[PDB]
Design a protein around this motif. Structure first.
Motif, short mmCIF file in Angstrom:
data_model
loop_
_atom_site.label_atom_id
_atom_site.label_comp_id
_atom_site.label_asym_id
_atom_site.label_seq_id
_atom_site.Cartn_x
_atom_site.Cartn_y
_atom_site.Cartn_z
N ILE A 37 33.36 35.29 33.98
CA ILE A 37 32.22 36.19 33.84
C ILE A 37 31.10 35.77 34.78
CG2 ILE A 37 30.35 36.95 32.33
CD1 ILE A 37 32.26 36.81 29.98
N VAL A 38 30.83 34.47 34.83
CA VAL A 38 29.78 33.94 35.69
C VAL A 38 30.01 34.26 37.16
CG1 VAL A 38 28.87 31.81 36.72
CG2 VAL A 38 28.89 32.08 34.22
N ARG A 39 31.20 33.94 37.66
CA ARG A 39 31.54 34.14 39.06
C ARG A 39 31.91 35.57 39.44
NH1 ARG A 39 37.77 32.33 39.89
NH2 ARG A 39 37.17 32.70 42.07
N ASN A 40 32.24 36.40 38.45
CA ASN A 40 32.62 37.78 38.72
C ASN A 40 31.48 38.79 38.69
OD1 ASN A 40 35.99 37.61 37.29
ND2 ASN A 40 35.19 37.04 39.30
N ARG A 41 30.72 38.84 37.59
CA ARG A 41 29.64 39.82 37.52
C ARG A 41 28.21 39.31 37.52
NH1 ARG A 41 28.22 41.81 31.42
NH2 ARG A 41 29.60 40.42 30.22
N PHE A 42 28.00 38.00 37.41
CA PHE A 42 26.64 37.47 37.42
C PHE A 42 26.28 36.69 38.66
CE2 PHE A 42 24.93 38.62 33.35
CZ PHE A 42 26.05 38.83 32.56
N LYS A 54 45.13 27.53 38.58
CA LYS A 54 44.37 28.64 39.14
C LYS A 54 43.97 29.58 38.01
CE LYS A 54 44.83 32.42 42.48
NZ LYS A 54 43.85 33.20 41.67
N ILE A 55 42.71 30.01 37.99
CA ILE A 55 42.27 30.95 36.97
C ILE A 55 41.83 32.19 37.71
CG2 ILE A 55 41.48 29.24 35.29
CD1 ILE A 55 38.56 29.93 36.30
N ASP A 56 41.91 33.33 37.03
CA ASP A 56 41.52 34.59 37.63
C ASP A 56 41.24 35.60 36.52
OD1 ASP A 56 41.24 36.80 39.48
OD2 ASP A 56 42.67 35.78 40.80
N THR A 57 41.10 36.85 36.92
CA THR A 57 40.86 37.93 35.99
C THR A 57 41.77 39.08 36.38
OG1 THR A 57 38.56 37.42 35.38
CG2 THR A 57 39.22 39.74 35.38
N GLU A 58 42.45 39.64 35.39
CA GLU A 58 43.35 40.77 35.63
C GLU A 58 42.77 42.00 34.94
OE1 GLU A 58 47.81 42.15 34.01
OE2 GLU A 58 47.43 40.10 34.72
N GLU A 59 42.76 43.12 35.65
CA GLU A 59 42.27 44.38 35.11
C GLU A 59 43.50 45.05 34.49
OE1 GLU A 59 40.96 47.67 37.84
OE2 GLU A 59 39.09 47.51 36.71
N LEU A 60 43.48 45.22 33.18
CA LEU A 60 44.61 45.82 32.49
C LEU A 60 44.61 47.33 32.61
CD1 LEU A 60 44.60 43.77 29.19
CD2 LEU A 60 45.52 43.15 31.41
N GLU A 61 45.76 47.94 32.35
CA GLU A 61 45.89 49.39 32.42
C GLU A 61 44.90 49.96 31.41
OE1 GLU A 61 50.03 48.62 33.16
OE2 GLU A 61 48.48 48.16 34.66
N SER A 62 44.25 51.06 31.77
CA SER A 62 43.27 51.67 30.89
C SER A 62 43.86 52.11 29.56
CB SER A 62 42.60 52.87 31.56
OG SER A 62 43.46 54.00 31.55
#
Lengths: 87, 87, 87, 87
Positions: free
Chosen positions: C47-52, D62-70
């Motif tokens: 959250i910190v590194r993505n949107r803030f 490695k950490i990341d963020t995945e956008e899931l299907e709506s």
């Protein structure tokens, strides 16, 4: 009551401080500032209630004048503002 | 209603403008300003009610945010304040 | 070094704490957590590194196991994670 | 490359799956998980390298963020972790 004094630091520092209190068990927070910092105080209140915590309302605004400690034999007057934000 | 917009001119210009209206048949006057001029607006209100017209009261204070016309493809937000002074 | 321990409180509390440090003179901040809080720790970092604060990078991630103080005669092992965020 | 996705099943299922690959001709194995399963993923990595296969090292995390299907018109973001274990 929780109070956040607004100075000359970036506006975001005061927004976070304000958000912190609201997120740390405070139902109300008072933003205070004097002189030219008054403008920043209003910015803080607006940023908080506009893009970070819609729902938070402006409960009361009070302006006044504070007589500062004398310097070189003259006590100067400075304007002050207090903005109460409520959940 | 009578409105006095506070800008970057000396504070005394706005104090006189405010006093003028109050002395020219106005029971109330609204002081408005945006951004950094907000600080000056509060100074105007304080000077008027403190050393020129004691008795005049602060009837209401409202803060908001105005979206300015876009410039180079970006609409900037600026804070605003409105201070109603009453006889 | 500045450290932010992530527990069971809402994720936003830890995001603000993290942002606060970065905005208060810290070039780096370490997010730590154990057990099930590990998931929240990663959320905080994202959250910190993505949107803030885009621009902030993940400098290092370390996982380990901590032996907790014994309870009823048994020392339990819990997983831990440390996430270093850098300006 | 061999990948082991960690879900909500008991931790031992994923430890065995991981050990199986390492014992079946794999010099490296990647443990992956999202959301709350991230905590379990770290547990798997720790159990494997602590009591079943000392010597195995954590090569990279490695950490990341995945956008899931709506769903119902909203694409939700979920955190992810990838842990590479090496012989």
């Amino acid at each position: 009551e929780h109070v956040v004094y607004v100075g000359n630091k970036p506006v975001m520092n005061y927004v976070l401080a304000t958000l912190t209190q609201l997120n740390e068990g405070a139902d109300e927070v008072v933003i205070k500032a004097r002189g030219r910092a008054i403008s920043r105080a209003v910015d803080v209140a607006e940023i908080v209630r506009n893009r970070f915590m819609p729902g938070v309302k402006v409960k009361e605004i009070k302006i006044d004048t504070e007589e500062l400690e004398s310097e070189q034999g003259r006590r100067s007057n400075v304007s002050t503002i207090e903005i109460v934000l409520a959940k």
